[PDB]
Design an enzyme around this catalytic site. Structure first.
Site, short mmCIF file in Angstrom:
data_model
loop_
_atom_site.label_atom_id
_atom_site.label_comp_id
_atom_site.label_asym_id
_atom_site.label_seq_id
_atom_site.Cartn_x
_atom_site.Cartn_y
_atom_site.Cartn_z
N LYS A 1 17.06 -79.98 -27.40
CA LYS A 1 15.66 -79.79 -27.77
C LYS A 1 15.30 -80.52 -29.06
CE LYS A 1 15.40 -75.42 -28.20
NZ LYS A 1 16.71 -74.76 -28.44
N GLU B 1 14.64 -72.51 -38.07
CA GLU B 1 15.75 -73.32 -37.62
C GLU B 1 16.76 -73.58 -38.72
OE1 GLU B 1 17.21 -74.61 -35.02
OE2 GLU B 1 16.07 -73.08 -33.94
N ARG B 2 17.71 -74.47 -38.45
CA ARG B 2 18.76 -74.74 -39.41
C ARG B 2 18.23 -75.54 -40.60
NH1 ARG B 2 20.65 -75.68 -34.24
NH2 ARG B 2 22.33 -74.24 -33.66
N1 LIG Z 1 19.70 -88.33 -26.10
C1 LIG Z 1 20.89 -87.77 -26.40
N2 LIG Z 1 22.02 -88.51 -26.43
C2 LIG Z 1 23.21 -87.97 -26.72
N3 LIG Z 1 23.38 -86.67 -27.00
C3 LIG Z 1 22.33 -85.82 -27.00
C4 LIG Z 1 20.99 -86.33 -26.69
N4 LIG Z 1 20.15 -85.29 -26.76
C5 LIG Z 1 20.89 -84.20 -27.09
N5 LIG Z 1 22.19 -84.52 -27.23
C6 LIG Z 1 23.28 -83.61 -27.59
O1 LIG Z 1 22.85 -82.27 -27.43
C7 LIG Z 1 23.32 -81.47 -28.52
C8 LIG Z 1 22.22 -80.52 -28.96
O2 LIG Z 1 21.32 -81.20 -29.82
P1 LIG Z 1 20.11 -80.39 -30.47
O3 LIG Z 1 18.84 -80.78 -29.77
O4 LIG Z 1 20.20 -80.55 -31.96
O5 LIG Z 1 20.46 -78.87 -30.12
P2 LIG Z 1 19.36 -77.84 -29.55
O6 LIG Z 1 18.95 -78.40 -28.21
O7 LIG Z 1 20.10 -76.54 -29.42
O8 LIG Z 1 18.30 -77.85 -30.61
C9 LIG Z 1 23.71 -82.41 -29.64
O9 LIG Z 1 25.09 -82.21 -29.95
C10 LIG Z 1 23.56 -83.79 -29.07
O10 LIG Z 1 24.78 -84.50 -29.25
MG LIG Z 2 17.39 -76.86 -32.61
#
Ligand SMILES: Nc1ncnc2c1ncn2[C@@H]1O[C@H](COP(=O)(O)OP(=O)(O)O)[C@@H](O)[C@H]1O
Ligand SMILES: [Mg+2]
Ligand SMILES: Nc1ncnc2c1ncn2[C@@H]1O[C@H](COP(=O)(O)OP(=O)(O)OP(=O)(O)O)[C@@H](O)[C@H]1O
Ligand SMILES: Nc1ncnc2c1ncn2[C@@H]1O[C@H](COP(=O)(O)OP(=O)(O)OP(=O)(O)O)[C@@H](O)[C@H]1O
Ligand SMILES: [Mg+2]
Ligand SMILES: [Mg+2]
Lengths: 383, 15, 520, 114, 435, 52
Positions: E154, E180-181
């Site tokens: 996300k 969030e963080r």
């Molecule tokens: N376009 C992308 N390419 C590679 N990895 C991705 C991509 N989008 C998300 N990720 C992976 O998904 C994980 C979650 O990312 P993040 O969005 O910060 O967490 P959340 O969805 O819980 O907020 C990350 O470790 C990232 O490596």
């Molecule tokens: Mg997040």
């Protein structure tokens, strides 16, 4: 502590008076010296004891009826839901941030009223009958109660006439009668609003072809939706020309939860004008499952005892006394009708849930809309 | 956990 | 009747008798000669029981202030009601009577931080329980500090090496992030944490003094025998001279198991705030949540889902957000947090599990169905992620690790078809065999963490196909033979050069040809 | 401290004040003096409505409710017990607890009078 | 004139006012506290007593501590003077660049505009993401949801949204980081320093985004109102200066979570799965202010956390109804390694009508949905047989849907720091023709 | 659902070996002989290590 030793104190047992005749001549100036740190004691008025989260507890109001519109001194309406021995728990039709501890509450003498008649036809009112579309007040209209009783066994007749939805799967597979309650149940984003809109648009397209007594007058009750979604709906119901026959009672997500509770009753009370007077009605309570959450909010803040999924005990009674108002009246009562389409949203197809069980028990049949058929090309996704 | 059994039911129901 | 309005006494308080006793008792003509107990900085106990004391008085007490009973046992003034104070008790409530005096201290709860805590085994309030004397070279800091904000932090670039192969290659961990270790019971959680602390001891001697990571182990709710086994192990390996051991155990009171991770985090914040690096491991954060649930249910706070309070998200979030990589204007120090969460039959849809999954950066999700398939450390690779990505992965390990992820991803989606051994494809069987060699590659004994250079050499051994002749049942010996039969001169220059240089990839292409393998 | 023992034990939070009122009157031997004054107060609440407004009406401020009873009981020869009883009830708004703190006082008074 | 603290239970303080109680939602300053403590009045308790929620930690509150009324809700600095700053929930600067210049000091609490000031202009927003531009196209002026569990992508999707549309946009934008963080809030702050969206020093006025941060460490009174703070900062640009704003909200789930964390201490008996009774009403009272009126427009992008991938949980289920376009992310496609992990058979929009995008885009999107649903209905057979009994009839549908599954993935520029692949911007006609 | 006639040779070997070592974990107890009849077996550690 006990009782028998406590009623014997009303008989005066002092027999010495070196305190009574001293303070009785001292009491009234000692209470007159703080005459401006007082509020005059209310009996038939009401003073707000404590307000919060859309619920005001009101001291006083000795002669309120249960379910009656009270009106706070800030202009905000109220509704005395539960009357208790010391206070009145009123629900606030609007923001409780204007109500303070100590504000005066005046009863209006009226159980909750909405304007019904021919003059509300084509307008967009909110859940109380107050128009929000911005084209003046409601003319050619009269007040009526939101909580009239359902017509009995002997006042109905058999549902022999068809109500055409204009949808092929609904008209061929699960056909609708002219006084029938038919649930439109399904997941999110499966097209329940679309089936209801198709019913309303087809009723408009057929009103120009039937001789004035087979005409169907629609009511779309939008409970807990967005305001922009309802604006899209008014745009579509005016660009089709459906708004000669449809009324929109819209208590949106920003409106206070008693208004979202009371909006299906307001819409059904406006739609019962056509049922009571020989015409035909059609009502879609869109997201009845959001009226349920508004009612749960008001009942949990009024400390009613919760049941399963924290809905109160009278949540079956809530939807049943609304849906049993959709009838097909006998010919001695004018022969009018009103057919309801409650819309219940399930979650991941879980139809075993509590409110879905309630409305499935009340209504005369479901129109299931599966999310798998909705992406398998089949739109409308009538399972 | 409760979502495992309902999906596993549909798995065995299509098998 | 005009007397029926006063029939049932409308009581606005429960302890009304302790207020009418404050005014009726000094009405005796004998009893005005300073014959009144005070309420400003002192307090009478109203009611003790289950480690809660309701205290009348303490009109000047602060919320969360450490108070003291006259029996000697301390407490924390947690509820501040209109008439009484709800004091949770930092010991046994059996020594606290109804009517005892409670002395406030003027202090929010304090722990000794400093270099004097290294080597020592303390409880959840900083008192040393090892029996080598008191704490000497320490100062008393707060236990509930604000987490550092947006400006105080910087990005996590430098890596923290665990020594476990499945988490230095697949789930890499940087100095300053928070990596959850989640699994069922007896799966490898305390084992992974212990391998991290032992490998920090291994790395602390080969780096200068600005790169050393001083670990802190917080053991909440375990037995004292488990803590004694771990202190014996951290002494036997030599890792005690960098490790602090904070142990609020199972016999200890529920406020001590509640305040133990804040104690250990405040001890680790000393090394974070002074430019050094820390490694805090809150072992069984779920048992902290259980102790907090007890402590809040007995304080008559309304329960919620699984009878946990409302603020149990805030309980873990305001603890884990104190693990930060600070900016260069604050010393540039770091703090890596390793919360351990125990789940029930792999259920991560539980309350505390979803909270600390959403709080932390990564997760090392361990399974008990891979633990008994021989794959130990039992890392479920498909669910174990690290959201710093390859930003704080070792280069050289990064050069083979993305392909390692990709080949295990192919092996996982070719699985659940390997029951058809007759299905000779040769387009899937190569990846079905390569994934078996890679799965056999990431197995590791416990209590022996491998350095990062030997790890990336031994994953460079398997991602290229050098072990493709070797049978799947003896790659755990083939990797040891590869590591022990290549030169000990390559690891010295891959540790220094920081990536697989082109003057090293063709050297050790060929150095892995003159090694002999247990496989034919 | 050292308060004389009650002739009988009773229930909580309203019979505890009446047990305290007896224990503090038996230390001063004003037991029939303050029993008679409580009987005067029950008839006093039936006489006035502006004094039973200080027990039931939830909107009177605590400063007003404690300054009326102080200024009314600054004199009149009332005991130092009963003047410290009604100020200590009007602070907490427990003036409606008079009607059954006098009842448990009689049953305490009909016990050492036997 | 002042009131005094009478009761402190965690983040919920009861303040006793001797006459003239403050209104509900009013703001109160605790005088004598070390840090600036601000309490927002939640309800009137009835004994000259309001019950508040605290905007900071109550560790150190004494009963009897005096409390002054401000006579208004939490008023935050708004205007051009906040562009390029980091704001607190209570409008304080936490970027350490000095105080914030003030066009006005607006209170954070309002009503949703009316029914009459609604603009019914469904018009497309082109993103640069193939699955977004194809199957769930976004609206300019309408609310967007990025639903997913923890770790499905996300925040990376919202970062690619930020550098794709907020990089090149006419009006300003507001990033409200709600609960969030602190780490990713810092990473986004530094990435917007380095690409010039936030400028420091004397070039500050040419910055085009305001950060408001209410991160996870902060007590739930702050996390519950930092979204309203960010929305007020956007509402000044929409109403007074009359322009098109974007409101990137990160994890609007934390707003409902923050209300739930204090709601049991507010005296509300608990509702269903762990949430407050007034869940839907609080979510609607926040969400209904984010509308394109006759004055301007706020094109919001709302990240939503879905607890344990359970879309039937009511805190992600209620906020499906306040949106125009939902982008549901899944762990299942992330198990295939495909990123962005958008579910193509769960992501909807109101912009997928053929009257707003045309028959070529609608029919390509519906053809993609048809072939993917055919593939999901054949996976139960090809997981027990293996594509040998379909006899070249429904086999080509599998070998086209398995190509469409790979082609829905796209490398992100914000994910170049993770994985060594450059980022793409796929134009709308280009992905329409390619699909 | 599919029976043992679907597994490979390496799988229908481990099915047989695992069904054998399932039975070999059973042991007649000395205190259970009153209601089973089979006398009890004390199994040494060397015996069970070699036997498995
Ligand atoms: N376009 C992308 N390419 C590679 N990895 C991705 C991509 N989008 C998300 N990720 C992976 O998904 C994980 C979650 O990312 P993040 O969005 O910060 O967490 P959340 O969805 O819980 O907020 C990350 O470790 C990232 O490596
Ligand atoms: Mg997040
Ligand atoms: N029969 C149909 N043919 C084509 N498209 C349809 C059909 N029915 C619905 N849709 C599309 O599906 C989307 C969702 O429809 P609708 O709004 O009726 O569902 P809903 O049940 O109201 O969902 P929610 O309650 O979550 O808003 C709409 O954008 C609409 O354009
Ligand atoms: N990689 C490994 N190789 C061999 N044995 C291991 C490995 N990892 C764990 N074990 C063993 O498996 C058992 C697992 O205990 P572990 O340390 O995992 O406890 P835990 O799951 O962290 O918490 P609890 O003590 O509640 O189970 C230990 O006896 C340990 O010796
Ligand atoms: Mg709908
Ligand atoms: Mg363990």
């Amino acid at each position: 502590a006990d009782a028998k030793a406590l009623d014997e104190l009303r008989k005066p047992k002092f027999s010495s008076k070196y305190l009574i005749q001293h303070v009785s001549q001292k009491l009234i100036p000692a209470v007159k010296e703080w005459e401006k740190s007082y509020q005059p004691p209310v009996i038939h008025l009401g003073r707000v004891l404590s307000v919060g989260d859309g619920i005001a507890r009101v001291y006083g109001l000795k002669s309120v009826q249960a379910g009656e519109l009270v009106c706070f001194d800030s202009g905000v309406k109220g509704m005395a839901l539960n009357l208790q021995a010391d206070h009145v728990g009123v629900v606030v039709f609007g923001n409780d941030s204007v109500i303070h501890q100590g504000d005066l509450v005046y009863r209006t003498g009226q159980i909750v009223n909405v304007p019904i008649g021919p003059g509300t036809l084509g307008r967009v009112t909110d859940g109380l009958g107050q128009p929000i579309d911005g084209k003046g007040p409601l003319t050619n209209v009269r007040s009526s109660l939101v909580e009239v009783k359902a017509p009995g066994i002997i006042a109905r007749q058999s549902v022999r006439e068809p109500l055409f939805t204009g949808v092929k799967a609904v008209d061929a597979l699960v056909p609708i009668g002219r006084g029938q309650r038919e649930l439109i149940i399904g997941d999110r984003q499966t097209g329940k609003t679309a089936v209801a809109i198709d019913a309303i648009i087809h009723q408009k397209n057929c009103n120009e072809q039937v001789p004035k007594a087979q005409r169907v007058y629609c009511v779309y009750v939008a409970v807990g939706q967005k305001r922009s979604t309802v604006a899209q709906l008014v745009k579509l119901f005016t660009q089709t020309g459906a708004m000669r026959y449809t009324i929109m009672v819209s208590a949106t997500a920003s409106d206070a939860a008693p208004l979202q509770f009371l909006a299906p009753y307001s819409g059904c009370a406006m739609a019962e004008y056509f049922r009571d007077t020989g015409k035909h009605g059609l009502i879609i309570y869109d997201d009845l499952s959001k009226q349920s959450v508004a009612y749960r909010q008001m009942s949990l803040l009024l400390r009613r005892p919760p049941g399963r999924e924290a809905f109160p005990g009278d949540v079956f009674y809530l939807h049943s006394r609304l849906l049993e108002r959709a009838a097909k009246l006998s010919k001695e009562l004018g022969g009018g009708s009103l057919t309801a389409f409650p819309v219940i949203e399930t979650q991941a197809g879980d139809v075993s849930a509590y409110i879905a069980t309630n409305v499935i028990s009340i209504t005369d049949g479901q129109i299931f809309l599966e999310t798998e058929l909705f992406y398998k090309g089949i739109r409308p996704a009538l399972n | 956990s409760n979502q495992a059994v309902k999906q596993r039911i549909r798995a065995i129901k299509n098998i | 009747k005009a007397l029926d309005e006063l029939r049932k006494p409308k009581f606005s308080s429960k302890y009304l008798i302790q207020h009418v006793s404050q005014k009726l008792i000094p009405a005796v003509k004998e009893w005005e000669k300073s014959y009144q107990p005070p309420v400003i900085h002192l307090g009478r106990v109203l009611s003790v029981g289950d480690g809660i004391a309701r205290v009348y008085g303490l009109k000047s007490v602060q919320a969360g202030e450490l108070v003291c009973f006259d029996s000697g046992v301390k407490g924390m003034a947690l509820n501040l009601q209109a008439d009484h104070v709800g004091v949770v008790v930092f010991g046994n409530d059996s020594v606290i009577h109804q009517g005892d005096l409670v002395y406030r201290t003027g202090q929010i709860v304090n722990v000794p931080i400093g270099p004097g805590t290294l080597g020592r085994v303390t409880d959840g309030l900083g008192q040393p329980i090892d029996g080598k004397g008191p704490l000497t070279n320490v100062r008393s800091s707060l236990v509930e500090v604000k987490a550092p904000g947006i400006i105080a932090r910087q990005s996590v670039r430098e890596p923290l090496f665990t020594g476990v192969k499945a988490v230095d290659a697949l789930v890499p961990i940087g100095r300053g992030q928070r990596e959850l270790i989640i699994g069922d019971r007896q799966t490898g959680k305390t084992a992974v944490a212990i391998d991290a602390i032992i490998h920090q001891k291994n790395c602390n001697e080969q780096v200068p003094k600005a790169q050393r990571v001083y670990c802190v182990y917080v053991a909440v709710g375990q037995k004292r025998s488990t803590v004694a086994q771990l202190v014996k192990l951290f002494t036997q390996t030599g890792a005690m001279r960098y490790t602090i051991m904070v142990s609020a155990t199972a016999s200890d009171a529920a406020p001590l198991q509640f305040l133990a991770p804040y104690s250990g985090c405040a001890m680790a914040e000393y090394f974070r705030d002074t430019g050094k690096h820390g490694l805090i491991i809150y072992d069984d954060l779920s048992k902290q949540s259980v102790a907090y649930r007890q402590m809040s249910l007995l304080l008559r706070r309304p329960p919620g889902r699984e009878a946990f309070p409302g603020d149990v998200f805030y309980l873990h979030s305001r603890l884990l957000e104190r693990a930060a990589k600070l900016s260069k204007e604050l010393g540039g120090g770091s703090l890596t947090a390793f919360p351990v969460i125990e789940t029930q039959a792999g259920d991560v849809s539980a309350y505390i599990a979803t909270n600390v999954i959403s709080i932390t950066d990564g997760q090392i999700f361990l399974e008990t169905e891979l633990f008994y398939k021989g794959i130990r450390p039992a890392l479920n690779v498909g669910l174990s992620v690290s959201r710093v990505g390859s930003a704080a992965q070792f280069p050289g390990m990064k050069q083979v690790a993305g392909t390692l992820k990709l080949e295990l991803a192919q092996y996982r989606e070719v699985a659940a078809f390997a029951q058809f051994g007759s299905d000779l494809d040769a387009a899937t069987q190569y990846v079905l065999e390569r994934g078996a060699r890679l799965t056999e590659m990431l197995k590791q004994k416990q209590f022996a963490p491998i350095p990062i250079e030997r790890q990336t050499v031994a994953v460079y051994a398997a991602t290229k196909g050098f072990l493709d002749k070797v049978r799947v049942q003896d790659i755990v010996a083939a990797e040891e033979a590869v590591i022990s039969q290549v030169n000990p001169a390559v690891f010295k220059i891959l540790k220094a050069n920081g990536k697989i240089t082109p003057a090293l990839d063709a050297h050790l292409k060929a150095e892995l040809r003159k090694v002999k393998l247990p496989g034919a | 401290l050292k308060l004389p023992t009650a002739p009988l034990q009773l229930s909580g939070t309203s019979a505890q004040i009446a047990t305290l009122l007896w224990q503090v009157a038996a230390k001063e031997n004003q037991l029939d003096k303050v029993q008679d004054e409580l009987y005067q107060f029950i008839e006093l609440f039936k006489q006035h409505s502006e004094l039973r407004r200080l027990a039931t009406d939830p909107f009177v401020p605590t400063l007003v409710r404690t300054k009326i009873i102080s200024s009314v009981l600054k004199d009149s020869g009332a005991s130092e017990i009963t003047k410290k009883l009604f100020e200590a009830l009007a602070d907490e708004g427990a003036l409606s607890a008079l009607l059954e703190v006098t009842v448990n006082y009689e049953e305490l008074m009909l016990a050492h009078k036997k | 004139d002042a009131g005094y603290v009478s009761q402190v239970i965690g983040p919920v303080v009861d303040v006793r006012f001797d006459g003239e109680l403050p209104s509900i939602l009013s703001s109160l300053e605790v005088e004598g506290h070390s840090v600036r403590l601000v309490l927002e009045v939640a309800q009137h308790m009835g004994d000259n007593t309001v019950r508040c929620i605290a905007m900071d930690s109550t560790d150190g509150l004494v009963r009897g501590q005096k409390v002054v009324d401000t006579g208004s809700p939490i008023k935050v600095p708004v205007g051009r003077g906040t562009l390029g700053r980091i704001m607190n929930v209570i409008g304080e600067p936490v970027d350490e660049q000095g105080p914030i210049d003030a066009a006005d000091i607006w209170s954070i609490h309002r009503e949703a505009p009316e029914f009459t000031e609604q603009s019914t202009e469904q018009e497309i927003l082109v993103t640069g993401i193939k699955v977004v531009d194809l199957l769930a196209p976004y609206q300019r002026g309408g609310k967007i949801g990025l639903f997913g569990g923890a770790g499905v992508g996300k925040t990376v999707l919202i970062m690619e949204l930020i550098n794709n549309v907020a990089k090149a946009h006419g009006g300003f934008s507001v990033f409200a980081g709600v609960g969030e963080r602190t780490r990713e809030g810092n990473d986004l702050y530094r990435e917007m320093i380095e690409s010039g969206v936030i400028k420091l020093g004397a070039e500050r006025g040419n910055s085009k985004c305001t950060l408001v941060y209410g991160q996870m460490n902060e007590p739930p009174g702050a996390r519950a109102r930092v979204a309203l703070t960010g929305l007020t900062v956007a509402e000044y640009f929409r109403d007074i200066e009359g322009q098109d704003v974007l409101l990137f909200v990160d994890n609007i789930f934390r707003f409902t979570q923050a209300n739930s964390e204090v709601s049991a201490l507010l005296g509300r008996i608990p509702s269903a799965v762990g949430y407050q009774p007034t869940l839907a009403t609080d979510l609607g009272g926040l969400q209904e202010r984010i509308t394109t009126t006759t004055k301007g427009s706020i094109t919001s992008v709302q990240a939503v956390y879905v607890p344990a991938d359970d879309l039937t949980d009511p805190a992600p289920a209620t906020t499906f109804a306040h949106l125009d376009a939902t982008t549901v992310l899944s762990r299942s496609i992330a198990e295939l390694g495909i990123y962005p992990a958008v579910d193509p058979l769960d992501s909807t929009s109101r912009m997928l009508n053929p009257n707003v995008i045309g028959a070529e885009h609608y029919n390509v999107a519906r053809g993609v949905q048809k072939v993917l649903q055919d593939y999901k209905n054949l996976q139960d057979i090809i997981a027990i047989l293996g594509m040998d009994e379909l006899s070249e009839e429904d086999k080509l549908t599998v070998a086209r849907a398995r190509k469409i599954q790979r082609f829905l993935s796209q490398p992100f520029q914000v994910a170049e720091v993770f994985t060594g692949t450059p980022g793409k911007y796929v134009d709308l006609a280009d992905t329409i023709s390619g699909f």
